[PDB]
Design a protein around this ligand. Structure first.
Ligand code: HEC
Length: 109
């Protein structure tokens, strides 16, 4: 894991498009896909998107989404919420996670 620090929103956007856009939307009103829509993610806890069928794992994990919570989850999702159906290896590079989270914090308003 690793302490969140501000990154490049611009590079965070490129990291979303190529690594997240396939399974998630982020724009308000965006449709769910394989993954929930992520708008307001930092306004709520895990498994709270109305309209999406979550695993018991994600729902009951009760995570309070925040920048360092997002960073540690994205390093290894399946280690953070065991049982999650999110097929994502993870992002090893602190810098890539700080770039992505910094973009998410702006686009999920
Ligand atoms: C499929 C190919 C996915 C990719 C690529 C990414 N995500 Fe995902 N994510 C996916 C699923 C199916 C789920 C639901 C998990 C479950 O166990 O039911 C998720 C969930 C998340 C969450 C939590 C959502 C919430 O609790 O409201 C987050 C924050 C999330 N995903 C973020 C995320 C990011 C940042 C990704 C790429 C950079 C990413 N996901 C890729 C499926 C898939």
């Amino acid at each position: 894991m690793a302490p969140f620090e501000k990154g490049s929103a611009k590079k965070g956007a490129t990291l979303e498009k190529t690594r997240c856009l396939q399974c998630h939307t982020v724009e308000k009103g965006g449709p769910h896909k394989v993954g929930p829509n992520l708008h307001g993610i930092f306004a709520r806890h895990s498994g709270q998107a109305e309209g999406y069928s979550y695993t018991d794992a994600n729902i009951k994990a009760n995570v309070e989404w925040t920048p360092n919570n997002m960073s540690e989850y994205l390093e290894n999702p399946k280690k953070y919420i065991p049982g999650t159906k999110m097929a994502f290896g993870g992002l090893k590079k602190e810098k890539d996670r700080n770039d992505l989270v910094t973009y998410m914090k702006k686009a999920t308003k």
